[PDB]
Amino acid sequence: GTTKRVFKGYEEIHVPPPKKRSDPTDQNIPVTELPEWARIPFNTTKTLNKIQSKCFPTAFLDDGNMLVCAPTGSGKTNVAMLTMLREIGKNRNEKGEIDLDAFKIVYIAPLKALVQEQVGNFGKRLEPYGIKVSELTGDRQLTKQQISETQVIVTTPEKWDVITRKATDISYTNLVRLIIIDEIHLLHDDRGPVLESIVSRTIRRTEQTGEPVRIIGLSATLPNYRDVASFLRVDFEKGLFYFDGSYRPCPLRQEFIGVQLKTMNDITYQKVLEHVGQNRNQMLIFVHSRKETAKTAKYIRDKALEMDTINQILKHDAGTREVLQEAASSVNNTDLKDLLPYGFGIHHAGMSRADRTDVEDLFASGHIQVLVCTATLAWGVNLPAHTVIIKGTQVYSPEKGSWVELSPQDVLQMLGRAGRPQYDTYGEGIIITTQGEIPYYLSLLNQQLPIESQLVSKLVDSLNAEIVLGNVRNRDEGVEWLGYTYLFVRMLRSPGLYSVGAEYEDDVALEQKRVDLIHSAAMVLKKSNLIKYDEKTGKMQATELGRIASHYYISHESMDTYNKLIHPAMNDVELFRVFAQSGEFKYIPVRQEEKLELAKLLARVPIPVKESIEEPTAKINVLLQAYISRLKLEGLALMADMVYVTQSAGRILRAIFEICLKKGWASVAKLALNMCKMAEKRMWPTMSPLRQYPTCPAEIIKKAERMDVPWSSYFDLDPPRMGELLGMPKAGKTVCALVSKFPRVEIQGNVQPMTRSMLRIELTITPNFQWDVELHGVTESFWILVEDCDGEEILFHDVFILRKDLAEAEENEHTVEFTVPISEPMPPNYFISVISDRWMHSETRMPVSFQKLILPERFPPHTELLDLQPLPVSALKAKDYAALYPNWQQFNKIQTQTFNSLYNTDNNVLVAAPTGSGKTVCAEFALLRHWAKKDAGRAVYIAPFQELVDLRFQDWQKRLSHLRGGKEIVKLTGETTTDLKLLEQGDLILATPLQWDVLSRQWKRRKNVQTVELFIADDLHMLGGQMGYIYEIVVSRMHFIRTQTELPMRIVGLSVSLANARDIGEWIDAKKHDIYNFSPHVRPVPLELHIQSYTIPHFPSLMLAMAKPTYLAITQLSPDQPAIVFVPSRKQTRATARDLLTACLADDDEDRFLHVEVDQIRKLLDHVQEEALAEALSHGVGYYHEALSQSDKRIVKHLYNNGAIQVLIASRDVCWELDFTAHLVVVMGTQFFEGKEHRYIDYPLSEVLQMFGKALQPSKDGRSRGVLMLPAVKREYYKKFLNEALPVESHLHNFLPDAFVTEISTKMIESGEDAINWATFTYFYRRLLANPSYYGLQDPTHDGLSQYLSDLVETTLKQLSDARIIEMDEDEGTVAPLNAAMIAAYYNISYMTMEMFLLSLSHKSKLRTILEIVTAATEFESIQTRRHEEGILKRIYDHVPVKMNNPVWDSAHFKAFVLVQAHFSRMNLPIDLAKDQEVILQKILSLLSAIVDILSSEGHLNALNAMEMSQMVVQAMWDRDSPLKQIPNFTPEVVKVANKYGINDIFDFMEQMNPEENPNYASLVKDLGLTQAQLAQAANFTNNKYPDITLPAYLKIHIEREDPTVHAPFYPGKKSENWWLVVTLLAIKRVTVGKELNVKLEFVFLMSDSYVGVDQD
């Protein structure tokens, strides 16, 4: 068939196009009448093509991966469309809309032009669905992350591979459920390994976890289609489609020409003559250089100008000849293209998009006959031509430095443009090349070039990536990975061309081959320090250097050289030298033709180049410099080499910068970041910063750079002063805008010395620049650096992100808390710098001076843990006391050392020992001595949190209620009138600090408070906890009491190992020998503690990343013992359960943590209330968090203690309530997000010690284990305070208003001098002398201390008087409460909430007003905010009548405002939001009664609507509503059925449905549809639950009735029914009603609190 024709110079080979052969089988194309949802994208077509026909069934129904092969222009993108359509249908409602946050789809294309054309096409075609298609482009992660918040994303393989390597977007990467790979034949190219890595890791994860993501490959007509088909896991019967060149819509005639190359130009000119003059067909030529396009076009046109052949090519129509040049030459800006009046065109992507679209539209209209172009036009257009001419096939690739043949994908995409199907009946594709290249391209176009792997050239690096991801931990996992690559599939079959060696004859699945290959790669990876490699165990772990080598594409050799060369004294010269030394440019040669220009270029550059002027290193150096300087280069190969160098520089310089940053070298790090910016913005630091603005005209830059005004003098100016300073009035308004948007930040810093060697710094960053999305986007990144006074070492570094929402708000400031070490010969100062990550000259630098800093007191040694004889239980002189400890014959080493002081002495005692040592038995020693006394006074045990008092009560009530004739052990409750009688009725009272506070406030009254003889303060360190200031207050008040009354009162305190136990001891007035402060290493079961650091800036990605390491920790450190994993939130608890279950699925052991057969557990599993918890427990994991029901918690506890399940995942919010024990404790998170400040706050050391204190189960070696996973920045912090004792400091100085409100409500404090003596009884006062700088004390003198206390009490009294809570008589200097601190202390609401409650009474308060004012209380601001819980709040807000004045969607105020209304409307809620609603309902009643009393204090009578709202929220109803909602099972439709019968109130309902009365008993029972039991419950409510009985000039009132509780099944716990007495309206009285009452009120409306519609008028 092929005709060979030999000529003078060239040898033509014509291959005839095979016949269409399109109707041997009558495969009628589908009608494309699909459902209504899958038709709108196919706008301009009614019939699918022949290719899409056989793919439509599998595409639209079958989910399996597939691969189609066809010629270019055949219709593959439409089968990819069909796959996207099956997915959109998957995410579509029956007839409703589509949830677009549930799924993502990724389209991978080889070049940028194709991704842009594809994003445009798919945007147009998918816009009616609301789907937003976007291109994954950024120079920054801040752009790519926001681009990952879209539905379908189009990207290149390199960008996708690099965003997956960073692992900082896994939270969204997991949401992809479909991937399309266009032009897979790239696998043959040197970039194929990127595709290999992508698909290998994706398919491996899918086959491990079972989470399906569809893979569809669209390749070209090629031989090895079955290889890549199996490599994509497609079914050869149902997923593999292959089509001949006859399935091409326009058959392609192929002639090959082979010829140093002037004959090529002559042949192109003669073919232009033949095809445009004789055949009159427009044609396009493809060349491989932007300048060579116009070079060849100019040659052809000049050759046509001579010999007078131009009139054959030229069109002579009066229209074309007159319109073409008029609309093109007069409107073109390209000087070299301006030669287009002769029908010629150039299109090489180095021209304006305006000129580009003009050329394209002109070629489409038929005005251009010869269009010469680059490969950029081949990819991503819709411009076909009859004749395409690939002029030349050799191109320069600066990677290898040698001339390389053209990529086989470019020639195919080019020849695809040959022959427009609608106009032409055939196309012509010609390839001009050299003779020797003829057999290469022929076989390529005639389906004979096979695809081979190039992974061997990039294996090592790629392997390292899989190791940095945590996907490859050992050689076996690496072999599993390498078993999914294309190299493996190409090794299995046809291994001869690969130098396998043939020694692996019996290698069944090439297992040993992959093992050997991965070991050989990991050896080189280990030598270069990119990885730790256990050569024998097979274990391997990535390093920080390997992480840098993976996140950026840096080669292993280059990273090795960077590690070898970089040192802290490095300058800009040596930095450029290290850059040019990189191995990416070693093939780039220095040529003789380059020297004449290289000498000049080196003369121009500013940085000295010391290498030999003729060495490649100097060439690469001067190339980078000259690119920075924006020098014009008249050299072709030189320009190509520079383009390559500068494309690599972006990653090379960032890798160098991160290396310097992680080595702690400050100067080199800042210099490397500045060089990064130099190459990114293409400017030197000595040029004008205005060069960073693209819209800034060059005139301004030149004027500025010819000036000497420093950059800082541009800021804080207006347009007139700006123009005056700049010397250009016209520039005034312009430049002032640009500078106004330059990233600018003001910083402040506060220093508190935690210890003598570690300071804590609070940095306050406030942005000071106008935001603009064109150059800022939505976020702006910064670096926070902390340096020595010498600028030598980096003491702290982190990233700091400005969000556009947070940077534009009124409350504009951000806070950042960190810790830095310090040496006792203190340095003069530290430095803090906030430096932009992309902008140049954007740095705010602040000194932190230490001349005023005073370090805390040295710590004294811990008390020696003496080696005593373990005292037997018989040392107790009672048999019943010894029976309290069954089967115990001794006590531990610390219980015997405190025994004499606690059991034989009534002195005050302090015991400080690690968690889990047994301090409860010390408290029991004290209690046993107390109860031995015949008097046996009352004892009071206090614990920081109700969880702890409950755990203690459940134990002591069953173990000690039988001693010495029986003791009454009680625990307090919320309100006062009941636990006040529990105090008198009991001998041992357990309480929380606040509960006992409300009782000890009434001392010198309520005689039963002084009689307390024993006071146990457990977990005393928690005085520095969440609400620890009230704890400090109550213990100091007990001391003050036992000072006022002279009766003896013992105090015994228990805490974890302290660093400052002297002050806590002397505080409770304990003697020196009674203060036991043991080392934090004396725990009876030692604790092997591992620490893992994580450099991951995205929180969900960090959690997902830690997921698998904790599985490894559990399976390797505690393989046959229970483990407990703590997690930052209850929301993340189920997520971590699922992640750990999937990690179990990764190995072929799904029930790894399940030991008992599931059938025994099945009952409890059925009884689990949460379906996710039941699914987890089904496979032996389970979890525990505050939203769980009591039954769920008890089931989880029964399952974990019995050993049926091995792991237990608990949120950090339940670590005090968790009555569990493990051999291994994992601390996954160290931070938790607090929605109040929009930031992550660190775990307080208190709860880390608490969580690790549950690792009490030992092993063979007699020790327990813990692991602590944290961000790197935090490691040295926690590590420190896990090897040393815990410093406890007071925060009473930060809550003095809320303490004085209670000390002034009672007349304890009555003046300023009356408050200093109160402060002297506190722990804060004793701490002021030991750590004065922590609290702001300047001089450590009695004068200074007393003056500081005076200033503090005066500013607290000022905050209170300015808030209108107390009268402050400044003359006498006294204070008094004014009818508002009473309410505050009675309901214990915050003082800031009290001041906020002043906004009422202005005009007056209404129902809709009070509903909004209550939820604004600060108590609800503590409620957690789960990220991305918006929308489910807006949907609820749209379904409630009363609206907010100004919505703030992420505000806890708006959250409470909406949830209260959802409670009124009985709207269902998800579990976590329902828990938040419960928490709100717990306090809304207290807040509402406080508001009632506040309104009653003045004249206004809006408080009545507040009482109505109280009864509303009790009954979950609205103000105006049918009371029948209170009746059980009365859905709104039943209320409608009742209203149809004439029922309006519960009274009228009770009067109806009575046999022989109102004869509707027949139809009413039938229409209500209620069962007999529902009617019985309704009768239960209506009979004796809903009330029925009703009732200075003084008044007298009576009331009677026909009792214990209130019927309100939608409210957690409600005190018995109360009543209001309301006669600018004055009188109020609040009393409970029982059976009968007679009360007379004196004045100068009978309302309820729990039921509606019962109101005397």
Ligand SMILES: Nc1ncnc2c1ncn2[C@@H]1O[C@H](COP(=O)(O)OP(=O)(O)O)[C@@H](O)[C@H]1O
């Ligand atoms: N069923 C059809 N009816 C009409 N035109 C079609 C049909 N299928 C594909 N085309 C057109 O054929 C051209 C080939 O484009 P495309 O299919 O995206 O490239 P490829 O064939 O390389 O996937 C497109 O411009 C498209 O509009």
Ligand SMILES: Nc1ncnc2c1ncn2[C@@H]1O[C@H](COP(=O)(O)OP(=O)(O)O)[C@@H](O)[C@H]1O
């Ligand atoms: N490095 C940082 N600097 C400042 N704020 C941060 C930083 N990281 C997170 N934040 C805060 O946390 C929120 C982002 O939470 P996160 O889950 O980490 O990212 P995402 O925005 O993807 O949810 C932002 O509102 C931001 O204010």
Ligand SMILES: Nc1ncnc2c1ncn2[C@@H]1O[C@H](COP(=O)(O)OP(=O)(O)O)[C@@H](O)[C@H]1O
């Ligand atoms: N002398 C002892 N020998 C063995 N186990 C003990 C001893 N004292 C306490 N325990 C165990 O310690 C657990 C409780 O420790 P706890 O008293 O809470 O210590 P801490 O209060 O310091 O956390 C109990 O389960 C108990 O069995």
Ligand SMILES: [Mn+2]
């Ligand atoms: Mn394609």
Ligand SMILES: [Mn+2]
């Ligand atoms: Mn304890």
